[PDB]
Ligand code: HEM
């Protein structure tokens with residue numbers, strides 16, 4: 001992430017604002033429907049439309065992304081409990097991070113069409129790759 | 140592609156509203172900006188250095204239109220994707236040497252563009268259907284590498 005990427009990410013996320021949790025939830029729903037192999041990590045969830053567990057989990061995802069945007073210079077330090085969780089405990093296949101990333105960009109396109117410019121798209125893609133890298137880095 | 144009748148009809152109904160020029164030009168432009176190695180294949184289009192230059196380049200718009208037109212052929216022939224994209228599979232493999240990973244990238248960009256243009260009408264269920272289509276197209280383009 002360049003200085004320019006960091007500016008774009010901070011900017012774009014300021015427009016997301018209080019919607020981070022609702023967008024996280026919608027991204028999960030888009031992923032579960034679009035890529036059914038991802039459901040197997042959530043056997044303990046009700047995955048029906050508007051289930052509360054997906055809303056609650058979407059909130060936690062949105063919050064972690066908000067945390068990351070505030071710590072762009074030290075993603076490893078800021079996300080390292082979540083690296084342990086995803087790599088050591090859950091053993092999430094690295095492919096699934098790319099699917100969720102795609103689903104989050106799709107969600108952002110839906111709700112912020114005028115703000116989701118090609119330069120902002122490019123910088124967010126890079127941000128979501130960097131996060132993904134940190135969450136898979138402990139194997 | 141495994142689509143129910145319901146899903147097929149929803150896919151076709153959205154395509155009625157797709158402006159191939161605008162969606163096509165945007166999808167190809169965003170591919171070039173977001174995945175910059177893809178620019179290697181389009182040096183003949185001139186300056187693709189910044190995003191401004193990419194999105195207003197008339198060759199990017201015209202090529203993007205041809206790409207989306209050909210996607211539309213696939214949408215109208217979902218029972219015969221192999222046959223529809225045979226000639227194009229050969230071109231991309233034997234003449235252009237495009238790695239097939241990049242066909243999935245473009246499909247996913249296209250999905251993001253549809254989202255942007257259609258908003259809340261591009262539901263999660265409709266997106267799921269479209270992910271099946273873009274994957275079917277990518278595989279049929281990859282056919283003559285295998
Ligand atoms: C941007 C990517 C991601 C972020 C920011 C993220 C973030 C989180 C957070 C914050 C937690 C909850 C931590 C807690 O409450 O202890 C969590 C748990 C979890 N994550 Fe992720 N996650 C990501 C990607 C993925 C992916 C791709 C999968 C699988 C397809 C996945 C599966 C899970 C599962 C199964 C749990 C445990 C959920 C539970 O039992 O309640 N995550 N993630």
Ligand code: HEM
Nearest residue numbers: 177180181205206209210235237241242243245246277280
């Ligand atoms: C996945 C869906 C894709 C479709 C449906 C598609 C379709 C087409 C079509 C219809 C042509 C025009 C051939 C002609 O006019 O005879 C073409 C040419 C071409 N495509 Fe693709 N394409 C796809 C992906 C890609 C990707 C990912 C790349 C590169 C990264 C690429 C690079 C090219 C190039 C260089 C040409 C020749 C351009 C020119 O000489 O004007 N295509 N493609």
